[PDB]
Amino acid sequence: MREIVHIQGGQCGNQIGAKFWEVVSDEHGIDPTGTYHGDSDLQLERINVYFNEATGGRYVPRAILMDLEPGTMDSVRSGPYGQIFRPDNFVFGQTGAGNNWAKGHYTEGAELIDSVLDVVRKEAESCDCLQGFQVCHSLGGGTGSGMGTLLISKIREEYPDRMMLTFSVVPSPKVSDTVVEPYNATLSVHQLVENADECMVLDNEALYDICFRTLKLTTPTFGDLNHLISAVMSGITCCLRFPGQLNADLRKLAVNLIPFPRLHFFMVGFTPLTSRGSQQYRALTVPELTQQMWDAKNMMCAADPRHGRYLTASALFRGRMSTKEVDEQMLNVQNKNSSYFVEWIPNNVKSSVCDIPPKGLKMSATFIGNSTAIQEMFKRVSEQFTAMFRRKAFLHWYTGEGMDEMEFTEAESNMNDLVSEYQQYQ
Amino acid sequence: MREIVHIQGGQCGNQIGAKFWEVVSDEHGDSDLQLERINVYFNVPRAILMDLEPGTMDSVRSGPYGQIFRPDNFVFGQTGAGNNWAKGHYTEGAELIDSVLDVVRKEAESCDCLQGFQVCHSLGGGTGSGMGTLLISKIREEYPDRMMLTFSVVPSPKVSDTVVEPYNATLSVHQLVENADECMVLDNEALYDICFRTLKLTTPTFGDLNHLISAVMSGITCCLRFPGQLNADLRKLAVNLIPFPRLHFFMVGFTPLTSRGSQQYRALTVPELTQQMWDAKNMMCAADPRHGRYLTASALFRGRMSTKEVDEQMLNVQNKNSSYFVEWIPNNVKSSVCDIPPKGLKMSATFIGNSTAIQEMFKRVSEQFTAMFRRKAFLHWYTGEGMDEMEFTEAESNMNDLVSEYQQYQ
Amino acid sequence: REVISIHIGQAGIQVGNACWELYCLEHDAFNTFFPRCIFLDLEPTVVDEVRTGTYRQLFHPEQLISGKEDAANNFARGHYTIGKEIVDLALDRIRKLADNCTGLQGFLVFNAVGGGTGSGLGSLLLERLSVDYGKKSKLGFTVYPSPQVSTAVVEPYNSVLSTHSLLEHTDVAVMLDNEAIYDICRRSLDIERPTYTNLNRLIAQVISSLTASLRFDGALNVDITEFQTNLVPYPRIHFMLSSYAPIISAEKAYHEQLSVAEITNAAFEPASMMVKCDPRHGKYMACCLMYRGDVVPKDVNASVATIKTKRTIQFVDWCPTGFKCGINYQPPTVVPGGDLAKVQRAVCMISNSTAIGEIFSRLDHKFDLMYAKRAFVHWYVGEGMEEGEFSEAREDLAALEKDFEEVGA
Amino acid sequence: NVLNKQRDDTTDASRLTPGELSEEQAYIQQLQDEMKQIDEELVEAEAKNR
Amino acid sequence: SEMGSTLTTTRNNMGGIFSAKEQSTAVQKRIKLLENRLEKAYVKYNQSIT
Ligand SMILES: Nc1nc2c(ncn2[C@@H]2O[C@H](COP(=O)(O)OP(=O)(O)OP(=O)(O)O)[C@@H](O)[C@H]2O)c(=O)[nH]1
Ligand SMILES: Nc1nc2c(ncn2[C@@H]2O[C@H](COP(=O)(O)OP(=O)(O)O)[C@@H](O)[C@H]2O)c(=O)[nH]1
Ligand SMILES: Nc1nc2c(ncn2[C@@H]2O[C@H](COP(=O)(O)OP(=O)(O)O)[C@@H](O)[C@H]2O)c(=O)[nH]1
Ligand SMILES: [Mg+2]
């Protein structure tokens, strides 16, 4: 029916998506060789959203891997569920950006994104009625930020009346891998404010604290973080793949959650998330799900909403549940903590239910809250960017490649008006 | 009943035809449908090998499927041409073509109702191009009312084997524009590019290229050999693609073509065949069709397919690319369906497009021809054999007025 | 199909003594050689070394022709006085060698133009072969004297007087110097002290690589009639630079990664030409590339593309398709005691350009200086010549210089 | 001898220097013009559809 | 000495050995990109027409 193509950029995007296709294929019962082995008819009836039957029970994922280094692509086909992707979908450069956003947006982008667009165009016309596009990338890298950024801009010029998601991890001062993170973040977000339909703000700090306290893991490699992110992404699209009492497509959530067109950066959470010592001691009820859902520490972004107010919030529930519990729980969590919600919008929480849980659990949830606390992140990177730019450090790879001085001044100005308009609407 | 006799000239023609008789023999073999339509290519194959260097004939008997030709059909000289069109057309032809005409007449009258003759040769070599050219002329004045096919490879500046390629190509096309009913233009540049991009081979020897050309030749004559929901013989396609009697140089493409790594990851449907069929990167000629317009187009399909899908898909490809087709002809596309696929597939397709971008190659060769002929390089090896100066001027004139009528109709 | 080989002089039959050793060591494919040869010389010393050598029984006794006394570095003596009694016996044998044959591709002649026998009776043999057969090809692989390395004194007189007939008698003429080959053995083969034997061994490699197309079946075969068209754009311009790759030792060969792309390059640098001349001064008229062994047509095709797109070397404005390729399957053989290692694939390039126009101009001054004072002329005139043919051979090379300059423009 | 060696290298260096490709730059210029023509052609057609 | 100086300045003027091929191959690839882009723009216009 409605179809979503998948686009993974850079190293972070590629590895996030690899675990994503593994988890999804397990939900629909496709083995790593790409054949159907499920039992229920509910699994076979909605695999056209993410796959195409090739020949004789061969279901291939509708995904496009794109980056600038061969190591990532080889690491995809090596691991399991690596043999399911069509090899033509490996659009692929060779030289590399080197964490230089200009090289990802002006130097190397000019020779790859045309090739990327051919594969993307083929995957859009391969399906009938597009629901939207799904892009997983970072904001601190070069080949994920710049390459994915220019791709997003060109795509919105081609298919403008279609939805678009960008799952993006953002950098933070405590988890600081690259040195030019602020230059990449502020310019990348400057493009996201005018191109993306809605963006989902992620960051690595929150992922580390989820695996520290909630999951109580000892050695949380990147496989577990990608495992966490994949559960959230599968949750946002369960409504398209399984029937339920209250369905909510991507368009339904965006039109309902975004009160003003430029304010489309979200904070995400997921429930339930429990450690192996406490997976036995818990119950599975809607209120138990709700408090662990709205918890401050359980946000999958390191921006505490309790420093500000909620504008809108959304809940996507999965499993056999009673809709009265759904509605009364949203009403109670809004009445006790009444100051944390915006005032000139009553009933700031939209909720929906789907009748198919993730495999291995009786009942789960997914939270999408559009709060006003996100301006902290924009200031936290803006001051670092201004601190660097007022002495032109690290600028010659930017100005020597094609940027001028006015682009950084444009970035600050757009940065400053967005944090100012967040401040007004709060 | 309806009959096609085969002629193979030169080293290029002989090795292509050897692969061609491998795939046809394998095609005619369980099913009784295979036995009813073997008179078209068999009586031993209805073929005549023809060359001047015994290495090619020995190479034919050495390989498998080399012991099935009748040794009397190995009509064959001994001295050799040497990439000299004048030698291939005036000296060595004068004593071997009489012999080939004996054997060709015996192979033609052996059957009841000829459909046509089928010649496979080159346009750069001497004994392939020139002798096969003279052969075509002798055949045209004896049998005028029969069909004629010539699969001819044309040289490119990017695949430049010999030094006198333009001197041979220009003269060869000077005879093709009057003698052959229609021709399917091929080249090695597009073939090598196809095996790189679509087939993704690392070591594309001539066996692969000759296998690709063979698949096309098998595809064009499937309608005679097998029953279909919509039959189109050779004469039917000719009248549907040729608007004017001299505009009979075609470009060819074959589908489906996928690398062995992606053979099981892909789907096989009529929309999927049409996307690869109309792909400009899938023509087997180095003439980008988007540099001009299409006069007409034809698609021959094999396999159990729904005819409605065929007609609606062709209408779509004509509506979407509406600038690339000629205006005074609506519905530029001829289609046909046969129910028997080639061995190893379920559903295949063959594209023949008569476009006006082919004038690029003819103009592309003339500048090399004019470059050499301006200051008379390499000319004595042709002149001292019997040719005169007015032959090159005549050949150049026909090249120029040919690209003009494409330019005119474009 | 067979082709017979004639060898003249001290240099000719020593080259043949190595060439035939390679042919027997290499071998129905033999039919083109098995020998169909003739050695002939005026001094009996080198021919009768073969008569008692290891290949006593291999050669039929009559084949080895030998005169009574030498021409002694005297073109006139070896062309007018002593040639007149031996040349008739030689060519009246070669005829019955051709009557033994049925599909004669041609003859191939080996001679050095510096001497009297290689030069004098070389031209004399050529003149009666041209009037007797005319149409059949005669490939002449000659050895011209080097500019600075030299063994004789009167060799300018011989080289000019020999060339005047090498123009209009031979069909395809390959130059080979000694300094260039000495440089090859010094540079690539790292042999610091080479002798004539090593030179003759790698000369045989070139000959074998251009006849292997007749002997063995390849992907793209090429006969002797093919070189006749594809490399000589004018009836009097047939003088070919030669090259070979990879000329490499036994240890270096394993270390390096021989392939098709780099050997197509290596066959084009002036550090690997068989004639001491710099083709950077000239413009290539045509090139011919014989590939032996493990060759697919793609990489040879890709290699000629890179050469055309380079700008370190240029072509004439006339030829966009300035190449002739050729591929054969059997790899080159090795000789025990030889210095060339076994290779999967090798390339012998034969080109034509205007760099050759420099060697004739260089030759002119040395001949001109000696002739002006009439040095050594009394030897040749008393032999039977006059001042007429000295001056007229001089003006023939003057015409050839203007010819190359005109065609090169 | 060394002067001749140096002179050849200069002539080689002068040959290698990149030279403007007239037959190709004009193609690029002509391609952009047709591109811009089609953009304006496209906007009128979109107006017609509304 | 003067010829050596001219050699060094000409050597600096060529902008490197590999410079000519890169500029040549870049403009050729640019030709291909405009051709590809022109096709997609034509398709949109003709689709609009129908
Ligand atoms: N490559 C090569 N060149 C040789 C060899 N022997 C002699 N030459 C060349 O031959 C030239 C002189 O001619 P020779 O062959 O030695 O003697 P000739 O040609 O028989 O003439 P006569 O001395 O009169 O008998 C010299 O310039 C040498 O360069 C050889 O073994 N190999
Ligand atoms: N969740 C997750 N994040 C990653 C992984 N690898 C790298 N990152 C993040 O990516 C950022 C650096 O971006 P990088 O991988 O260089 O992006 P790219 O070069 O554009 O592909 C760091 O802040 C990391 O937190 C991974 O396997 N999982
Ligand atoms: N596709 C294909 N082309 C070939 C083959 N053999 C030769 N050619 C082409 O034929 C041309 C040379 O033809 P040539 O051998 O001179 O023909 P002939 O001398 O008249 O027999 C070259 O451009 C080759 O690309 C082959 O087996 N397959
Ligand atoms: Mg001697």
Side-chain angles (χ1 to χ4, degrees):
Chain A
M1 192 64 277
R2 307 173 292 243
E3 302 103 311
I4 315 164
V5 307
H6 199 100
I7 290 170
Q8 320 187 8
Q11 176 183 37
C12 179
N14 275 314
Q15 294 177 14
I16 282 182
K19 271 292 297 196
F20 167 70
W21 283 111
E22 192 176 347
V23 64
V24 161
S25 301
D26 295 327
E27 265 192 11
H28 277 287
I30 294 92
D31 291 331
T33 176
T35 78
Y36 178 63
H37 279 252
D39 53 74
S40 163
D41 302 68
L42 278 152
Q43 318 180 358
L44 183 63
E45 62 155 50
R46 291 305 169 196
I47 48 179
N48 49 0
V49 64
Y50 285 168
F51 301 92
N52 315 311
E53 190 179 296
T55 314
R58 195 54 186 239
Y59 300 114
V60 292
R62 190 183 290 113
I64 295 95
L65 300 176
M66 62 95 88
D67 49 308
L68 296 178
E69 300 314 340
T72 45
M73 311 280 256
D74 303 351
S75 308
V76 189
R77 279 173 278 211
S78 307
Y81 291 96
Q83 288 281 126
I84 59 183
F85 302 125
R86 172 184 293 159
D88 312 77
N89 297 339
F90 285 176
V91 68
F92 179 75
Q94 72 196 262
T95 62
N99 292 341
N100 197 239
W101 195 88
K103 287 186 64 143
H105 204 271
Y106 290 101
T107 300
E108 276 70 21
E111 309 80 21
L112 201 80
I113 292 185
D114 46 359
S115 198
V116 187
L117 280 174
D118 293 331
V119 178
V120 169
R121 203 161 295 111
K122 183 195 68 133
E123 283 294 7
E125 60 84 20
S126 179
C127 73
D128 60 359
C129 187
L130 274 172
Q131 168 80 11
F133 305 123
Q134 198 179 308
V135 175
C136 301
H137 65 84
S138 290
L139 288 192
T143 181
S145 286
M147 201 39 80
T149 288
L150 198 149
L151 183 52
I152 285 301
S153 190
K154 287 184 82 68
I155 287 171
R156 282 296 294 265
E157 290 320 312
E158 271 200 4
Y159 297 155
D161 54 356
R162 305 261 60 101
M163 282 306 168
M164 180 151 263
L165 304 187
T166 78
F167 301 101
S168 43
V169 297
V170 305
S172 166
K174 310 173 62 188
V175 287
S176 297
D177 296 332
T178 311
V179 176
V180 292
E181 282 169 352
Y183 278 76
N184 298 351
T186 182
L187 269 72
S188 280
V189 172
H190 165 257
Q191 205 81 22
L192 282 191
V193 177
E194 291 279 327
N195 290 334
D197 263 346
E198 67 262 33
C199 172
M200 185 179 287
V201 190
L202 276 294
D203 50 4
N204 308 121
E205 285 175 359
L207 294 177
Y208 290 173
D209 273 7
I210 286 167
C211 302
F212 285 166
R213 285 169 192 191
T214 57
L215 269 298
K216 298 188 180 181
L217 269 62
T218 300
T219 67
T221 186
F222 279 131
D224 312 340
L225 313 186
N226 303 300
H227 186 101
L228 182 78
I229 292 169
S230 46
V232 176
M233 295 161 58
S234 42
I236 309 307
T237 178
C238 191
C239 275
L240 316 173
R241 304 183 282 107
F242 292 123
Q245 293 148 333
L246 280 77
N247 60 7
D249 292 331
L250 267 53
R251 199 175 303 273
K252 183 159 282 196
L253 285 176
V255 176
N256 291 318
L257 194 84
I258 302 174
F260 294 91
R262 279 153 68 249
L263 288 63
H264 53 274
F265 296 129
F266 309 141
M267 293 180 183
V268 292
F270 172 76
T271 289
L273 287 180
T274 56
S275 44
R276 294 321 171 61
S278 184
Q279 182 61 255
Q280 202 272 298
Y281 295 152
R282 78 175 188 185
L284 275 300
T285 79
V286 177
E288 289 184 18
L289 173 149
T290 304
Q291 297 93 26
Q292 199 264 331
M293 174 177 213
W294 291 90
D295 204 331
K297 54 155 291 163
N298 206 24
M299 293 322 290
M300 185 179 288
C301 201
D304 217 358
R306 300 182 294 175
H307 293 41
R309 63 184 72 193
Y310 277 97
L311 279 79
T312 56
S314 285
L316 315 180
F317 296 140
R318 300 177 59 199
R320 194 71 70 72
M321 44 196 309
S322 177
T323 76
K324 192 188 96 65
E325 281 177 3
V326 173
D327 277 357
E328 64 90 19
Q329 287 303 306
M330 300 299 110
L331 180 64
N332 295 115
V333 166
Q334 188 166 161
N335 282 326
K336 293 172 199 168
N337 294 98
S338 292
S339 177
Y340 290 132
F341 286 96
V342 76
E343 64 182 0
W344 47 277
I345 299 90
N347 290 318
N348 311 271
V349 177
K350 163 169 178 37
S351 43
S352 44
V353 190
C354 165
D355 199 3
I356 298 300
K359 304 262 199 93
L361 282 153
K362 188 261 281 188
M363 189 203 64
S364 159
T366 294
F367 172 74
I368 304 100
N370 183 17
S371 88
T372 196
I374 74 172
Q375 57 157 26
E376 61 162 300
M377 291 323 182
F378 285 124
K379 287 177 63 65
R380 189 152 70 143
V381 62
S382 175
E383 291 316 278
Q384 295 180 349
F385 180 73
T386 55
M388 278 194 198
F389 195 70
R390 186 262 182 275
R391 186 32 180 81
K392 313 294 175 291
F394 296 100
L395 206 78
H396 56 295
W397 298 291
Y398 291 145
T399 288
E401 279 72 347
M403 276 163 285
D404 311 330
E405 167 173 310
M406 294 317 81
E407 282 86 357
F408 299 94
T409 72
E410 291 180 353
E412 62 86 23
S413 58
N414 289 104
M415 203 75 182
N416 290 320
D417 60 52
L418 276 296
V419 308
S420 181
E421 71 186 33
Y422 265 104
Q423 189 281 358
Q424 65 202 69
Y425 284 120
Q426 70 174 15
Chain B
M1 192 171 258
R2 313 180 297 271
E3 306 297 322
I4 295 296
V5 75
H6 197 185
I7 309 173
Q8 313 189 10
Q11 172 178 20
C12 167
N14 280 326
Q15 298 173 19
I16 291 175
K19 278 293 300 172
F20 172 64
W21 286 111
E22 177 145 15
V23 65
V24 166
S25 43
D26 198 309
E27 183 156 76
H28 283 299
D30 43 357
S31 160
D32 59 272
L33 305 174
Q34 294 181 359
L35 273 300
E36 53 174 29
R37 292 306 170 195
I38 59 172
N39 314 67
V40 62
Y41 281 163
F42 299 99
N43 297 323
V44 297
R46 195 181 279 106
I48 295 92
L49 302 189
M50 180 255 278
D51 191 272
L52 289 175
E53 306 150 358
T56 76
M57 301 288 208
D58 304 358
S59 294
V60 161
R61 290 161 215 116
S62 296
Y65 302 71
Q67 297 310 92
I68 73 178
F69 294 141
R70 174 189 286 104
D72 310 322
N73 296 137
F74 283 11
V75 63
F76 181 75
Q78 70 208 346
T79 61
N83 294 299
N84 191 331
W85 201 88
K87 291 186 67 66
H89 202 79
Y90 284 93
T91 50
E92 278 67 20
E95 305 79 8
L96 200 68
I97 199 56
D98 56 8
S99 290
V100 175
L101 287 174
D102 186 325
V103 191
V104 163
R105 267 179 294 240
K106 189 179 70 65
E107 272 312 323
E109 308 303 8
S110 179
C111 62
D112 57 359
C113 182
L114 274 172
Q115 176 80 9
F117 314 120
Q118 175 184 16
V119 178
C120 176
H121 68 97
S122 187
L123 298 187
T127 181
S129 88
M131 180 144 41
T133 296
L134 192 156
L135 163 78
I136 284 300
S137 278
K138 289 276 189 295
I139 289 175
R140 186 62 133 177
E141 273 76 345
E142 284 187 9
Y143 292 129
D145 64 278
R146 292 305 93 193
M147 282 315 263
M148 177 69 63
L149 289 189
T150 63
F151 309 75
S152 56
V153 293
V154 167
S156 167
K158 310 331 301 173
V159 289
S160 43
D161 191 0
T162 68
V163 189
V164 287
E165 283 165 353
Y167 279 85
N168 303 339
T170 309
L171 269 63
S172 63
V173 62
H174 178 74
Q175 297 291 110
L176 279 191
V177 289
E178 294 142 5
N179 274 115
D181 296 331
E182 77 264 23
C183 318
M184 283 73 74
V185 183
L186 275 298
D187 47 5
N188 305 122
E189 184 178 0
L191 281 174
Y192 279 140
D193 181 289
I194 278 178
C195 282
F196 282 176
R197 298 272 201 64
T198 51
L199 268 184
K200 293 190 178 187
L201 304 182
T202 49
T203 61
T205 180
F206 280 126
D208 311 296
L209 315 180
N210 297 348
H211 180 71
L212 288 184
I213 294 169
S214 286
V216 161
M217 287 162 44
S218 171
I220 297 171
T221 180
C222 182
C223 275
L224 304 178
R225 296 180 279 127
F226 292 99
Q229 300 163 3
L230 197 68
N231 298 115
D233 49 3
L234 290 174
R235 200 176 304 268
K236 209 153 147 171
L237 303 173
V239 73
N240 273 112
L241 290 188
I242 299 179
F244 301 93
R246 64 177 294 165
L247 280 292
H248 57 55
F249 295 144
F250 304 150
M251 305 145 48
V252 182
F254 183 76
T255 43
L257 261 57
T258 51
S259 88
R260 174 176 318 284
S262 43
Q263 183 66 40
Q264 66 271 21
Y265 290 100
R266 196 167 92 130
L268 275 299
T269 60
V270 189
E272 183 55 20
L273 274 175
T274 317
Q275 274 304 110
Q276 197 178 351
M277 165 176 68
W278 285 96
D279 202 327
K281 291 291 141 277
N282 218 33
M283 306 299 100
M284 279 190 263
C285 165
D288 204 355
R290 31 189 157 87
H291 287 177
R293 309 167 175 262
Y294 284 99
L295 278 75
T296 48
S298 70
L300 319 180
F301 288 154
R302 301 184 67 193
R304 258 146 191 85
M305 42 192 59
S306 169
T307 72
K308 190 267 180 174
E309 272 186 346
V310 170
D311 290 329
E312 61 86 17
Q313 280 303 104
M314 309 298 328
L315 167 64
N316 182 340
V317 178
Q318 191 176 269
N319 272 340
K320 180 260 288 175
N321 304 89
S322 57
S323 80
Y324 286 151
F325 295 89
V326 71
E327 183 179 0
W328 48 91
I329 297 170
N331 265 317
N332 307 106
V333 180
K334 164 76 185 47
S335 297
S336 75
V337 192
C338 176
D339 312 284
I340 290 299
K343 295 295 221 83
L345 296 178
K346 294 223 321 180
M347 173 174 323
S348 84
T350 297
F351 172 79
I352 302 98
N354 178 15
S355 175
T356 185
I358 194 65
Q359 66 102 25
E360 78 181 20
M361 281 195 176
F362 286 139
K363 180 176 70 177
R364 171 196 215 189
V365 303
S366 81
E367 291 96 50
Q368 304 188 180
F369 190 96
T370 54
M372 307 280 178
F373 197 51
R374 208 182 304 96
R375 307 204 308 146
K376 309 295 178 290
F378 301 92
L379 206 73
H380 50 289
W381 303 100
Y382 297 146
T383 318
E385 273 166 20
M387 298 168 32
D388 293 338
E389 192 89 352
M390 292 316 130
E391 277 97 349
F392 301 96
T393 75
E394 289 162 6
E396 202 180 287
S397 87
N398 289 108
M399 293 297 294
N400 201 270
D401 53 42
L402 183 63
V403 306
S404 89
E405 318 178 0
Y406 279 91
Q407 187 51 236
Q408 163 194 0
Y409 282 138
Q410 178 184 311
Chain C
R1 46 188 195 277
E2 52 270 7
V3 70
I4 70 173
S5 86
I6 299 94
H7 305 252
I8 312 166
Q10 174 63 256
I13 64 175
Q14 292 193 2
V15 166
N17 191 352
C19 168
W20 284 105
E21 164 183 0
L22 178 69
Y23 289 164
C24 312
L25 194 39
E26 188 161 39
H27 296 163
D28 194 19
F30 55 74
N31 188 359
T32 191
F33 284 162
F34 307 112
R36 283 180 200 57
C37 73
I38 187 170
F39 296 177
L40 73 164
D41 54 355
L42 297 192
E43 59 204 311
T45 310
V46 54
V47 57
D48 205 307
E49 184 276 358
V50 176
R51 286 163 163 144
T52 300
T54 316
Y55 305 156
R56 200 201 308 135
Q57 307 106 16
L58 186 153
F59 298 88
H60 186 98
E62 61 72 21
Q63 280 179 352
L64 316 181
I65 310 298
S66 172
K68 196 65 71 62
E69 67 83 18
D70 206 321
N73 290 319
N74 198 1
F75 171 78
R77 183 171 182 84
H79 186 97
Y80 294 94
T81 301
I82 319 296
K84 284 322 185 44
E85 294 80 359
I86 190 167
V87 61
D88 288 320
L89 171 54
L91 62 86
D92 285 337
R93 189 269 286 273
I94 296 169
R95 175 65 143 123
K96 67 176 290 294
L97 265 179
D99 310 296
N100 185 304
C101 166
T102 175
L104 191 46
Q105 306 288 319
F107 312 89
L108 63 93
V109 184
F110 288 164
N111 70 325
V113 303
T117 318
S119 161
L121 187 155
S123 74
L124 181 51
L125 202 51
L126 266 296
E127 295 186 3
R128 296 197 68 172
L129 261 61
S130 46
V131 300
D132 215 320
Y133 303 95
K135 62 183 179 297
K136 294 197 175 310
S137 43
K138 301 186 273 297
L139 304 186
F141 302 73
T142 78
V143 193
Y144 290 98
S146 190
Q148 293 280 17
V149 166
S150 286
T151 67
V153 184
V154 288
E155 43 183 3
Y157 286 71
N158 288 333
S159 314
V160 171
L161 287 181
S162 88
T163 297
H164 176 60
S165 304
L166 195 145
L167 274 74
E168 53 96 18
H169 282 133
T170 296
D171 305 359
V172 178
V174 172
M175 271 80 61
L176 310 160
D177 285 331
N178 292 355
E179 183 176 1
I181 309 190
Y182 281 145
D183 272 340
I184 283 184
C185 304
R186 192 202 160 275
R187 201 56 49 56
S188 45
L189 268 168
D190 282 287
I191 299 170
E192 71 276 17
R193 196 180 293 107
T195 183
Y196 276 173
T197 311
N198 301 314
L199 273 50
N200 300 355
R201 284 198 197 275
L202 59 93
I203 291 310
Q205 294 294 119
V206 167
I207 299 300
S208 45
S209 158
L210 60 89
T211 44
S213 60
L214 306 181
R215 271 186 285 119
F216 303 109
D217 65 354
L220 276 79
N221 309 333
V222 54
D223 306 340
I224 303 308
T225 296
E226 299 272 358
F227 286 16
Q228 300 272 69
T229 71
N230 277 113
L231 281 77
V232 297
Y234 285 92
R236 66 192 289 165
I237 306 180
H238 46 68
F239 297 92
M240 311 295 157
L241 288 72
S242 192
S243 177
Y244 197 87
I247 296 299
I248 187 168
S249 160
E251 50 280 40
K252 300 196 190 68
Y254 303 150
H255 272 114
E256 275 171 34
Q257 161 197 23
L258 293 162
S259 162
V260 179
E262 62 272 31
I263 68 181
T264 317
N265 291 311
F268 274 138
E269 47 164 3
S272 295
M273 293 278 128
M274 300 267 259
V275 58
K276 189 58 68 181
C277 81
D278 203 348
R280 301 193 194 89
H281 311 132
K283 296 172 71 175
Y284 284 162
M285 297 180 183
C287 283
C288 181
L289 291 163
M290 321 287 275
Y291 281 62
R292 290 198 50 176
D294 187 12
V295 168
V296 55
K298 264 313 281 178
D299 44 5
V300 57
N301 184 359
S303 277
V304 308
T306 74
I307 294 311
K308 288 189 76 175
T309 67
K310 257 190 182 177
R311 315 168 100 230
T312 313
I313 61 169
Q314 296 171 342
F315 286 70
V316 71
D317 313 326
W318 304 349
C319 295
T321 72
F323 284 87
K324 174 79 189 50
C325 296
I327 301 169
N328 191 11
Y329 280 163
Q330 185 179 1
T333 63
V334 296
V335 193
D339 299 327
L340 301 91
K342 304 171 54 47
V343 289
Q344 308 206 4
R345 57 192 80 85
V347 168
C348 177
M349 183 278 288
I350 303 181
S351 167
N352 196 3
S353 88
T354 64
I356 71 180
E358 84 183 29
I359 75 182
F360 295 119
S361 76
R362 178 159 63 255
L363 183 63
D364 219 351
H365 292 279
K366 313 173 68 168
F367 172 88
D368 160 72
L369 294 174
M370 278 156 208
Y371 188 55
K373 296 284 190 300
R374 286 305 194 273
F376 305 94
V377 70
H378 75 94
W379 290 108
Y380 299 92
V381 160
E383 285 277 17
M385 282 177 32
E386 57 277 353
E387 320 305 326
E389 293 179 359
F390 272 133
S391 47
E392 81 190 10
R394 175 39 179 104
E395 209 71 9
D396 201 358
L397 288 179
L400 181 59
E401 277 309 302
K402 298 303 293 175
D403 194 334
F404 268 96
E405 183 296 327
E406 86 178 26
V407 162
Chain D
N1 269 338
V2 190
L3 184 135
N4 287 27
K5 183 182 176 181
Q6 292 223 320
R7 178 170 297 158
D8 190 357
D9 186 317
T10 73
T11 299
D12 289 331
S14 84
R15 270 169 167 173
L16 283 180
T17 307
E20 202 284 300
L21 283 74
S22 64
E23 78 291 332
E24 190 167 17
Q25 187 275 328
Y27 195 20
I28 295 288
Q29 214 294 339
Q30 164 180 356
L31 283 194
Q32 313 269 37
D33 292 331
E34 306 216 10
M35 183 79 153
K36 182 175 73 68
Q37 165 181 357
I38 297 304
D39 308 308
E40 207 281 343
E41 195 54 46
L42 177 137
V43 66
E44 62 81 20
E46 75 191 324
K48 262 187 168 182
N49 281 319
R50 284 302 285 110
Chain E
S1 296
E2 62 82 32
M3 187 81 197
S5 46
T6 53
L7 182 62
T8 300
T9 177
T10 290
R11 200 172 284 193
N12 297 117
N13 287 10
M14 54 156 78
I17 182 53
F18 293 163
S19 87
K21 303 332 310 173
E22 290 147 49
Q23 70 82 9
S24 199
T25 194
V27 64
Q28 185 61 256
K29 186 190 141 59
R30 166 167 178 186
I31 292 287
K32 255 161 59 163
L33 177 136
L34 290 196
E35 180 48 77
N36 272 342
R37 283 182 175 171
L38 178 84
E39 196 55 281
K40 300 257 176 157
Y42 275 36
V43 161
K44 286 332 307 185
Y45 176 46
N46 302 6
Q47 185 174 0
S48 88
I49 295 294
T50 60

